[PDB]
Nucleic acid binder design. Structure first.
Ligand SMILES: [Mg+2]
Ligand SMILES: [Mg+2]
Ligand SMILES: [Mg+2]
Ligand SMILES: [Mg+2]
Ligand SMILES: [Mg+2]
Ligand SMILES: [Mg+2]
Ligand SMILES: [Mg+2]
Ligand SMILES: [Mg+2]
Ligand SMILES: [Mg+2]
Ligand SMILES: [Mg+2]
Ligand SMILES: [Mg+2]
Ligand SMILES: [Mg+2]
Ligand SMILES: [Mg+2]
Ligand SMILES: [Mg+2]
Ligand SMILES: [Mg+2]
Ligand SMILES: [Mg+2]
Ligand SMILES: [Mg+2]
Ligand SMILES: [Mg+2]
Ligand SMILES: [Mg+2]
Ligand SMILES: [Mg+2]
Ligand SMILES: [Mg+2]
Ligand SMILES: [Mg+2]
Ligand SMILES: [Mg+2]
Ligand SMILES: [Mg+2]
Ligand SMILES: [Mg+2]
Ligand SMILES: [Mg+2]
Ligand SMILES: [Mg+2]
Ligand SMILES: [Mg+2]
Ligand SMILES: [Mg+2]
Ligand SMILES: [Mg+2]
Ligand SMILES: [Mg+2]
Ligand SMILES: [Mg+2]
Ligand SMILES: [Mg+2]
Ligand SMILES: [Mg+2]
Ligand SMILES: [Mg+2]
Ligand SMILES: [Mg+2]
Ligand SMILES: [Mg+2]
Ligand SMILES: [Mg+2]
Ligand SMILES: [Mg+2]
Ligand SMILES: [Mg+2]
Ligand SMILES: [Mg+2]
Ligand SMILES: [Mg+2]
Ligand SMILES: [Mg+2]
Ligand SMILES: [Mg+2]
Ligand SMILES: [Mg+2]
Ligand SMILES: [Mg+2]
Ligand SMILES: [Mg+2]
Ligand SMILES: [Mg+2]
Ligand SMILES: [Mg+2]
Ligand SMILES: [Mg+2]
Ligand SMILES: [Mg+2]
Ligand SMILES: [Mg+2]
Ligand SMILES: [Mg+2]
Ligand SMILES: [Mg+2]
Ligand SMILES: [Mg+2]
Ligand SMILES: [Mg+2]
Ligand SMILES: [Mg+2]
Ligand SMILES: [Mg+2]
Ligand SMILES: [Mg+2]
Ligand SMILES: [Mg+2]
Ligand SMILES: [Mg+2]
Ligand SMILES: [Mg+2]
Ligand SMILES: [Mg+2]
Ligand SMILES: [Mg+2]
Ligand SMILES: [Mg+2]
Ligand SMILES: [Mg+2]
Ligand SMILES: [Mg+2]
Ligand SMILES: [Mg+2]
Ligand SMILES: [Mg+2]
Ligand SMILES: [Mg+2]
Lengths: 84, 50, 96, 64
RNA sequence: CUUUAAUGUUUGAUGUUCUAACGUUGACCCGUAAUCCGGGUUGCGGACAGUGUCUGGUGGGUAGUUUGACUGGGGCGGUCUCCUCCUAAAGAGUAACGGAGGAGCACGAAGGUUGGCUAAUCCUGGUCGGACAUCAGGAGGUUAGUGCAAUGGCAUAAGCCAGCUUGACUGCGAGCGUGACGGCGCGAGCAGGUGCGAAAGCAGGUCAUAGUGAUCCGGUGGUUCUGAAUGGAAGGGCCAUC
RNA sequence: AAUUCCUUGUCGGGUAAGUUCCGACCUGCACGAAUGGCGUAAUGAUGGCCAGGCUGUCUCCACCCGAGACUCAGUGAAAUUGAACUCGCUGUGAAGAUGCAGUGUACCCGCGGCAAGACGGAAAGACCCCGUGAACCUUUACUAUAGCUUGACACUGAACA
RNA sequence: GUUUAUUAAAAACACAGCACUGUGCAAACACGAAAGUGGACGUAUACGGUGUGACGCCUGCCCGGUGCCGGAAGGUUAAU
RNA sequence: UGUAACGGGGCUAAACCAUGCACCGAAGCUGCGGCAGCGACGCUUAUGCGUUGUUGGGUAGGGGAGCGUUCUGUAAGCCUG
RNA sequence: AGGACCGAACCGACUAAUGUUGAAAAAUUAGCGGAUGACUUGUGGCUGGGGGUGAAAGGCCAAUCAAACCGGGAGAUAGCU
RNA sequence: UUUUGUAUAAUGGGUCAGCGACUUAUAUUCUGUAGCAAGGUUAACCGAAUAGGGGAGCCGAAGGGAAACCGAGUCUUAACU
RNA sequence: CCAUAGGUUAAUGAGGCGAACCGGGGGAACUGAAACAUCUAAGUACCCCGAGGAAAAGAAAUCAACCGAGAUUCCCCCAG
């Protein structure tokens, strides 16, 4: 014909971005309950004064200053808080 | 969507109830659970209904 | 209320409550309204003559608002506890 | 002529002391078994209209 | 009650006649100088036909309308909501009819807690038995496993097994994340009443991220609310639900 | 084939040469029996094909006769028009220039004639797309409805089996 | 013969003939809220609708679907 | 369509590669004069002045300030054969 | 005798040219068809707009027809220019 | 004028003169200004009256709750630090 | 058959026109709902009938709420 009709793709789908990542970095002063990192799995583990939610959201269990550190035999990344 | 909504009614007679789902093709027997009754503020037996 | 064609805010939210017909006939009277009444006794009829509240009013309340400085009698009007303390301090007598 | 209020909006908003508007939360009508109890408990109380939506509400409710 | 015979009422149906409503575009007389009409007589039909109200069916005969968007023009095809990865340029976010895959559930245990346990694969030896079943040892170290895609995570296991059990609790909720908004998500701690554990403690569902639908309109149960003269009631409101 | 896409199917006739024509073949994409099949004398300002005669249709135009065109006197329009002191070329640029750049050419103004351009004049493109436009038409779209038809009640009564 | 007055005169429409079908007269059917009127001052050799289209030779098989005609036992079914 | 692939003439540098100093070159900057907006400060009591710094391309659009026209009052006033 | 044949009037409109701001909002010129019939024509009447009429072309119904014209609802509506 | 972009060969205008398009009524909100001030103001109507009368009313001085109801607190809940 | 229908004469009245207002009988659609069918426009436009200087309505089988008011009509609130 004058023009050749094309096909169709089968890859159009994608899901919404979940806004994961670190919310407060090292040195941030946070209130109790502040979300530090939103995660899939425990890439960062909960240290002192830090709690882990059902979806592994790390949140502050006290007022203070955020600190990242590496601890344990496995060199895992822990998030703790110095109470200030 | 085989599982269907069912109502669990308290045996304390206060008319409060919970809702959940059950597969009835298997496990056809009634569901019984000690659950909290907000009206009498106690734990009582809830029985299958609806 | 038009939002381009999506469900407007005043239609995607649920309706709630009901309009009570007793609230229409219930009114409120401040302590300062008592002093602008002539007679020394506060009633529905006397307040309607003084024009503090409307003539359709069947129920009235005295709340702690303003300052009362004169002795006055409130008969057959519900009175809050703060207004009751204030009226007693000002020297008035309260009854039903 | 007098401005006619939107009656559907007057059945859904109520004026507060400072001039804001309160409304009942959505998503609490007919599909409630699958919803978590925490989510429904938070949807039970009344909520204030958002700053982006005050404009539409005041337009719909002239007298209020 | 399977049943017949029979008394008696009602209901219902059918057929048969009758004339007196009604029909007569049958005849004759009169208004009348009239193929209209009306009156009279007569014949025929006859409670039928026909018409009014209600009602079931049928009804492009007629009428009012609808018949989406995206789109390397439109049509055709495909797509439309949600989840995972890449594009995505080491915070977040980020388009294309870009590249690849999935979801519209499941489980009263596959949830809570306590205690206990640790794979894939290969080698060697061993009844059927062999490349590959169960067994013993060794190597190896997660190359396995996760109810279902993908990514991140998991040994203190989040993986496997058993005992007990219902916290898959009720009212809240500091603070925070994420959205234009509707809304969505996380959450210590408080109160009440529970389960497991000796106890410290843990538990407001599941390794996490899909498994979903506003409002209106109604249905169901309850309610210390309202109730159009009053007392009720209907209806409404609130709470829980469909 | 008024039907056959492939297709100028193949074979034969006609022509020096025939995608058309005529006769056959049948592989009928996708003929077919009263939305008729096949045939048919006559008829047709009907479609196609061939032949004779005839010719300026043509080879290939020539000449002639008249009406205009042309000149003079009289009368005297029209479309159109932002303004205009209104050249060629190459390039540029809303991507095809009288107008911009570079360059070349060109004394000023008429009259007869031609039509390459002024994306010339004429008609708010009719094709195409869009509008949550219109109209009219169709139907087993939706909702109705005239009509047709069903039954109950009313006009409507008597007696019997 | 007729036709798109003003770009289409035709192979289109019509036609005589053929068939199917309705219609028993206050006919079917049509125009009319109705009275009436046409059909027709006609009466099945008449009238209406539909398709085909002089004439010649003919018109084959299928009633599953939709329509139409007939049946009425049974299921379902309105107002009441 | 016509040189038509330095803009042209022309160029053996008037091309290119280095080094260096000059000069040209904009509505940029500076000088001189003027206007305006905003701020600061001083004074005056302000309803402004002065000093000082800085700003002043502009469509959609927002803000501020005016001119002019007809008519009404001031106006049986004032101008005008 | 004949919807018979040839052919004027008469009715039509097949071809070509001209004309196309025309002599003419459909004609002229040269041919062309029917021309006793289903012909043609004068006068009068009747059918009215979702209606008429139509040997059927969506044709015609006052140079207007897939729903005439005139007046009104009406300044319809126009996310368009 | 429309556009991402027009000398555009994209739209509109032959020229001149006259006319030609953000209005009016009511309601509501904000600003400025003026009066009064925990008060403000009248509408119809009366009045010869731009006066005066007329406070019927409306807005404000109290909110919370679906509501009864309570009240500088109230709702939520058995109860709230 | 009495009668009645019909016929003749006489007396009185009406007819038709007119801008708006009024009462009654019929009664749209565009439009809005960002489509459209309930709904809206709107009982509007329009058609028709009748009457008067006005018309219509009108002296509670009406409101109210345990207190009471006292026919109808119009204006301002109530109140968007
Ligand atoms: Mg794929
Ligand atoms: Mg939508
Ligand atoms: Mg008052
Ligand atoms: Mg509910
Ligand atoms: Mg007859
Ligand atoms: Mg139909
Ligand atoms: Mg239709
Ligand atoms: Mg589209
Ligand atoms: Mg393209
Ligand atoms: Mg499609
Ligand atoms: Mg990133
Ligand atoms: Mg980045
Ligand atoms: Mg699990
Ligand atoms: Mg009552
Ligand atoms: Mg071919
Ligand atoms: Mg050949
Ligand atoms: Mg052949
Ligand atoms: Mg074929
Ligand atoms: Mg047929
Ligand atoms: Mg056939
Ligand atoms: Mg034939
Ligand atoms: Mg002929
Ligand atoms: Mg001359
Ligand atoms: Mg040129
Ligand atoms: Mg050029
Ligand atoms: Mg030049
Ligand atoms: Mg030249
Ligand atoms: Mg010339
Ligand atoms: Mg030319
Ligand atoms: Mg010429
Ligand atoms: Mg040209
Ligand atoms: Mg042109
Ligand atoms: Mg649209
Ligand atoms: Mg023609
Ligand atoms: Mg003709
Ligand atoms: Mg012909
Ligand atoms: Mg035929
Ligand atoms: Mg046959
Ligand atoms: Mg059949
Ligand atoms: Mg050359
Ligand atoms: Mg300079
Ligand atoms: Mg500047
Ligand atoms: Mg400027
Ligand atoms: Mg003849
Ligand atoms: Mg003549
Ligand atoms: Mg012709
Ligand atoms: Mg001629
Ligand atoms: Mg002839
Ligand atoms: Mg002839
Ligand atoms: Mg005409
Ligand atoms: Mg019409
Ligand atoms: Mg129409
Ligand atoms: Mg017609
Ligand atoms: Mg209108
Ligand atoms: Mg208009
Ligand atoms: Mg323009
Ligand atoms: Mg454009
Ligand atoms: Mg463009
Ligand atoms: Mg330019
Ligand atoms: Mg030009
Ligand atoms: Mg131009
Ligand atoms: Mg122009
Ligand atoms: Mg003007
Ligand atoms: Mg205003
Ligand atoms: Mg003010
Ligand atoms: Mg409508
Ligand atoms: Mg409509
Ligand atoms: Mg609309
Ligand atoms: Mg619209
Ligand atoms: Mg009079």
């Amino acid at each position: 014909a004058h023009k050749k009709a094309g096909g169709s793709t089968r890859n159009g789908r994608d899901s919404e971005a979940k806004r994961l990542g670190v919310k407060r970095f090292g040195g941030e002063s946070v209130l109790a309950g502040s979300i530090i990192v939103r995660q899939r799995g425990t890439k960062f583990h909960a240290g002192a004064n830090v709690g882990c939610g059902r979806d592994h959201t790390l949140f502050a269990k006290a007022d203070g200053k955020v600190k990242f550190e590496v601890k344990g035999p496995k060199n895992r990344k822990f998030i703790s808080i110095e109470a200030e | 969507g085989i599982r269907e909504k069912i109502k669990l009614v308290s045996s304390a007679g206060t008319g409060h109830f919970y809702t959940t789902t059950k597969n009835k093709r298997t496990k056809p027997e009634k569901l019984e659970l000690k659950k909290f009754d907000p009206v009498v503020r106690q734990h009582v037996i809830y029985k299958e209904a609806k | 209320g038009f939002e381009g064609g999506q469900m407007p805010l005043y239609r995607r939210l649920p309706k709630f409550g009901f309009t009570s017909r007793k609230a229409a006939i219930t009114a409120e009277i401040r302590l300062s309204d008592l002093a602008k009444v002539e007679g020394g006794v506060v009633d529905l009829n006397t307040l309607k003559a003084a024009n503090i509240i409307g003539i359709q009013i069947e129920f009235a309340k005295v709340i702690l608002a303003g300052e009362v400085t004169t002795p006055v009698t409130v008969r057959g009007l519900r009175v809050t506890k703060g207004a009751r303390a204030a009226i007693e301090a000002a020297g008035g007598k309260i009854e039903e | 002529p007098k401005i006619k209020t939107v009656r559907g909006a007057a059945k859904r908003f109520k004026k507060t002391g400072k001039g804001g508007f309160k409304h009942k939360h959505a998503n609490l009508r007919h599909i409630l078994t699958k919803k978590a109890t925490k989510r429904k408990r938070h949807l039970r109380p009344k909520a204030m209209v958002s700053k982006g939506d005050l404009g539409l509400v005041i337009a719909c409710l002239p007298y209020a």
